[PDB]
Design a protein around this ligand. Structure first.
Ligand SMILES: [Mg+2]
Ligand SMILES: [Mg+2]
Ligand SMILES: [Mg+2]
Ligand SMILES: [Mg+2]
Ligand SMILES: [Mg+2]
Ligand SMILES: [Mg+2]
Ligand SMILES: [Mg+2]
Ligand SMILES: [Mg+2]
Ligand SMILES: [Mg+2]
Ligand SMILES: [Mg+2]
Ligand SMILES: [Mg+2]
Ligand SMILES: [Mg+2]
Ligand SMILES: [Mg+2]
Ligand SMILES: [Mg+2]
Ligand SMILES: [Mg+2]
Ligand SMILES: [Mg+2]
Lengths: 184, 173, 234, 179, 91
RNA sequence: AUUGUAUAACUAGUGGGCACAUGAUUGUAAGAAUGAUGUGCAAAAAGGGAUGAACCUUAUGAAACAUUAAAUAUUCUAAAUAGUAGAUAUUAUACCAUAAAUAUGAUGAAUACAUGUAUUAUUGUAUAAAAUGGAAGAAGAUUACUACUUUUAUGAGAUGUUUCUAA
RNA sequence: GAUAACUGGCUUGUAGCAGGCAAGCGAUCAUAGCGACUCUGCUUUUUGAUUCUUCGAUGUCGUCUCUUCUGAUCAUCGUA
């Protein structure tokens, strides 16, 4: 338990940040985000183009939270400058899979998964969209301004499209994430 | 000497505020409570559900009509807390309960009347800082309170809008 | 000790306790949801039960069939509109705002409101002014969310019933706009509407009524309990 | 004791210098004298603690002893905070153990009472169960604990989180600031 | 405001705050050493104090010099002062 | 230490006992059976253990005023939410109304060795299953729980001061 | 009821239901599935041991009809 802990975060010039009491507002070219920081028991001071977070007389369970809330707010800076992109490619054996997109990238429709008649629907989270890729012919890319909406949606397709009641070490049919890069 | 007092119940612990009121009634005053859906209950949300679920199990087996009743509204739930402090069976406690009134949010009559707070019951000055808690009306939505949305809108608009001498001294002497 | 063999219980606990109803025309507890896109239309009616016969019909499945079904007949004369209410939303719940009646009210409603000596009480009373009703309709249009009308029946056209008191009811109006709903209902004062306007063929309904009476009954006809053996006393 | 609610500058325990010997007899007149320092609340409690210590190192029963003289020691305090290191032996459920602590206080009477406050949580024993060996003033470069070494560095500044009300009344109106 | 050597302090309650003190040394995260007006040194926790907005330099001073920087109406006279504001609201 | 001590004559009730503390014999064990020393209930008031024959303070006529013991001070309920610190598990009873072998975490705790591996002390969770709707006395409490000190106050035919009745 | 046959109460030898350690079986592999020699528990559902309440009286075994409750779950539901 040290006396003084400190963390610094350097912002770029194109991403503008202004804060009221215990609330953040990020405005840049590729979108907008707002963040609530009132729940934590810490101090927030915006200096000249840098965010400083200080914390006095903490124990070991409170020291570890200072790094986590730093990296969470660090991701929201780059997310408004550069969007994210997650590429998920479907692998199949003896059957084929068709991808249908409805209402401008808000609904993904999956058909003929292992030869079943009932199609599956998936909604998208807040501030995200899905597009096809005609080049690689077997994958799609989820692109959005914010990271936790994108990374939650890709995890939803992987868990819901697995096969149950059968031997999973033999069948090997699903949708799997290939790469995670930024939009630019 | 007996006074009439309007109390804002927000930012208060639920059990500790009801302790100080029950002595204030037994000396013969009159008191009214506003915004009882914003009191605080300490602890996680997960224990506070388990406590209320055990209260919903007690019912009379022979005739369930003549059994323990479970009120849902945050006004009528706050009245059951204050009744545990007062000897409500004798004549001494029957009189003190006739001077108590609680309400949901802020009604129309009390927009201009002042309010008070208790410094022995506020959360910033009662406990240690940095532990988890929950509200009262947040808990009662899961048990079947039909209307928690309209009360939030009407009260917040109310809480937004409020945020020749020397001659007479010589003549009268 | 435990019970030897398993068996379900006799009777339903959803209807305990069993009491006689307080009125002969029960109110409606629920009404369907309104959509602001669709047209303005009523939701209810009042009728009288007549009898029962049977018809036959066809169904193809290829070859046809002959099915024999039993139908029932309800005799429905027209109904007249004579009032408009309004309800608002509060913190506690729905609360009434105002009530506006028409000018000339039939004596059938006067028989319903005032039982005996209805000629004495109705002659003494008097109506509202122009200025009273112009304030109430304004306070309906600004504060209401649910608008309902008042409908009374016409039992004097069926002389078998020996009835001159007319039953009254409340019927919700599901339509486009709240201000548009009041202007529709003010037009229809003292004007009738038939059964053909609301329901068409192939539309499922709900029926609200009162059952037949059977008096003081035993245990077997009330619940369904198995009798005792023949040898038993008492 | 004006600002605080208990006397933290003059604790109940004090410092007494004791001395005793045996009662003279015919076989042995003029016997040996001993001396020590025990920490207690009065000289009667310090008489009982010291006579039990003389039972263990030598076979001297306390019924045959005689108390010579006991005086109290006080220190002219200036007010500078110093560093102290206490070594002691405490009795617990399983047996005896010996440990070592480092503190920071004004005088060695006050630095002893900061040990009793820490021992109320970590050890959970009555105050008569700890036997103190020695108290010494520590100079620099002997500090073996980072807690003392963190506060010894000069020019310290750190704020305070405000959580105490400034009025002893039953009710105040809303928007009065308890600063 | 911070905790430092020379910070002026007072009792916490808004009444009964007539006497002030100066921090001499820092013991721990929650304990401080003061100097009264009489000259005795008291050890007292932080939770009994409130801070004032003034800092002195005591790096070289003696004992007595820090004590340097530390430092009735009847019923008839309360009849006049009530009378003066009585007419100002009457106008 | 005791103002008396000692000696005769006449006559009633009782001879099914039980409990607490210390220590034993038989029995797998028992609110089981049977002995030893002390004090009680029986035959003993008031105050406290929520309630209870035996637990804890405590000697006796009718009353008034002040001081304490046993036990308590958020509210029912007379009396300061008067201090340092830790506990996340719907935690909290002297007799007293149950929990084990075993497996693993955490401390600005200590000692040995190379920021971490070994032991020791304190402490948390799992192990932990029942018959109408439930018992920290209850409402409820995370500063009303647990550990260790100093002050203030409330509170018994107790103990002091005054009036009156009994050989 | 100073003293048995029936209900209730304290106890758990007997009854029932679980645990800890790991010699071995399983084609090699202790722990997929089982587990010797030993050790620690819970429940009141068999049968005992004792004699606290009832002998100026509390109607015994089994069956028929009917309601409600417990988890140590036979199917039905969700996972590994
Ligand atoms: Mg499987
Ligand atoms: Mg039938
Ligand atoms: Mg017969
Ligand atoms: Mg007797
Ligand atoms: Mg008694
Ligand atoms: Mg008890
Ligand atoms: Mg009181
Ligand atoms: Mg007193
Ligand atoms: Mg006496
Ligand atoms: Mg007395
Ligand atoms: Mg007997
Ligand atoms: Mg029986
Ligand atoms: Mg057995
Ligand atoms: Mg009977
Ligand atoms: Mg009988
Ligand atoms: Mg189970």
């Amino acid at each position: 338990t040290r006396i003084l802990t400190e963390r610094k975060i350097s912002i770029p010039g194109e991403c503008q940040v202004d804060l009221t009491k215990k609330c953040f507002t990020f405005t840049g070219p590729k979108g907008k985000l707002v963040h609530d920081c009132s729940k934590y028991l810490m101090y927030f001071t915006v200096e000249d183009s840098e965010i400083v977070i200080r914390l006095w007389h903490a124990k070991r369970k409170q020291i570890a939270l200072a790094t986590t809330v730093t990296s969470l707010l660090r991701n929201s800076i780059t997310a408004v400058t550069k969007g994210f992109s997650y590429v998920m490619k479907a692998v199949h054996k003896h059957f084929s899979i068709n991808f249908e997109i409805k209402e401008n990238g808000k609904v993904l429709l999956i058909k003929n998964f292992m030869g079943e008649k009932a199609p599956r629907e998936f909604r998208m989270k807040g501030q995200a969209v899905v597009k096809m890729l005609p080049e690689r012919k077997g994958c799609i890319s989820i692109e959005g301004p914010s990271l936790p909406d994108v990374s939650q949606t890709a995890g939803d397709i992987t868990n819901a499209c697995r096969a149950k009641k059968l031997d999973a070490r033999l069948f090997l049919d699903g949708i799997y994430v290939v790469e995670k890069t930024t939009m630019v | 000497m007996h006074k009439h007092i309007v109390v804002d119940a927000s930012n208060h612990v639920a059990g500790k505020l009801a302790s100080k009121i029950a002595k204030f009634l037994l000396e013969g005053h009159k008191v009214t409570v506003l915004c009882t859906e914003r009191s605080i209950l300490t602890g996680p949300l997960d224990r506070s559900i388990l406590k209320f679920k055990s209260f919903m199990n007690k019912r009379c087996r022979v005739n369930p009509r003549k059994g323990p009743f479970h009120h849902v509204l945050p006004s009528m739930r706050f009245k059951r807390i204050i009744r545990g402090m007062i000897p409500y069976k004798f004549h001494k406690g029957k009189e003190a309960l006739k001077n108590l009134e609680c309400h949901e949010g802020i009604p129309s009559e009390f927009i201009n009347s002042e309010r008070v707070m208790f410094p022995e019951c506020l959360l910033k000055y009662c406990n240690k800082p940095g532990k988890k808690y929950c509200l009262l009306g947040e808990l009662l939505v899961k048990f079947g309170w039909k209307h928690s949305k309209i009360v939030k809108e009407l009260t917040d608009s109310i809480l937004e809008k409020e945020k020749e001498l020397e001659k007479r001294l010589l003549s009268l002497k | 000790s435990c019970r030897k063999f398993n068996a379900p219980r006799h009777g339903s606990l959803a209807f305990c306790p069993r009491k006689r109803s307080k009125t002969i025309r029960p109110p409606i507890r629920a009404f369907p949801k309104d959509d602001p896109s669709s047209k303005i239309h009523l939701t209810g009616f009042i009728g009288y039960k007549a009898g029962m016969t049977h018809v036959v019909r066809t169904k193809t499945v290829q070859s046809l069939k002959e099915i024999l079904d039993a139908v029932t007949i309800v005799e429905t004369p027209a109904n007249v509109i004579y009032g408009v209410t309004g309800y608002e939303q509060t913190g506690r719940g729905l609360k009434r705002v105002a009530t506006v009646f028409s000018n000339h009210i039939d004596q059938g409603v006067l028989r319903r409101r005032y039982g005996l000596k209805w000629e004495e009480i109705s002659g003494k009373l008097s109506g509202l002014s122009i200025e009273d009703t112009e304030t109430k309709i304004s306070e309906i249009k600004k504060r209401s969310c649910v608008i309902r009308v008042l409908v009374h029946s016409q039992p004097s056209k069926i002389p078998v019933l020996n009835l001159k008191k007319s039953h009254t009811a409340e019927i919700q109006v599901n339509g486009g706009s709240i201000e548009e709903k009041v202007d529709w209902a003010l037009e229809h004062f003292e004007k009738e509407f038939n059964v053909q306007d609301i329901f068409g063929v192939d539309e499922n309904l709900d029926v609200i009524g009162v059952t037949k009476g059977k008096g003081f009954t035993g245990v077997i006809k009330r619940f369904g309990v198995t009798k005792q053996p023949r040898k038993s006393r008492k | 004791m004006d600002f605080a609610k208990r006397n933290y500058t003059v604790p109940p325990f004090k410092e007494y210098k004791l001395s005793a010997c045996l009662t003279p007899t015919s076989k042995n007149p003029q016997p040996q004298i001993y001396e020590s320092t025990i920490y207690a609340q009065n000289h009667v409690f310090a008489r009982s603690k010291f006579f039990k210590l003389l039972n263990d190192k030598y076979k001297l029963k306390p019924s045959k002893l005689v108390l010579l003289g006991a005086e109290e020691i006080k220190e002219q305090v200036t007010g500078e905070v110093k560093n102290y290191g206490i070594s002691f032996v405490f009795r617990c459920k399983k047996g005896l153990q010996n440990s070592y602590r480092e503190f920071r206080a004004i005088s060695r009477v006050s630095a002893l009472d900061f040990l009793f406050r820490e021992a109320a949580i970590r050890i959970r024993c009555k105050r008569n169960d700890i036997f103190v060996i020695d108290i010494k003033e520590l100079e620099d470069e002997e500090i073996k604990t980072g807690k003392v070494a963190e506060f010894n560095q000069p020019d310290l500044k750190f704020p305070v989180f405000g959580k105490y009300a400034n009025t002893r009344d039953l009710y105040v109106p809303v928007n009065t600031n308890l600063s | 405001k911070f905790i430092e050597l020379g910070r002026l302090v007072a009792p916490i309650i808004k009444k009964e705050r007539n006497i002030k003190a100066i921090i001499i040394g820092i013991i721990d995260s929650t304990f401080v050493v003061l100097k009264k007006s009489n000259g005795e040194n008291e050890v007292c926790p932080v939770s009994s104090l409130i801070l004032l907005d003034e800092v002195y330099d005591i790096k070289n001073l003696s004992s007595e010099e820090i004590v340097k920087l530390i430092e009735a109406s009847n019923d008839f006279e309360r009849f006049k002062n009530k009378l003066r504001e009585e007419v100002k609201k009457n106008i």
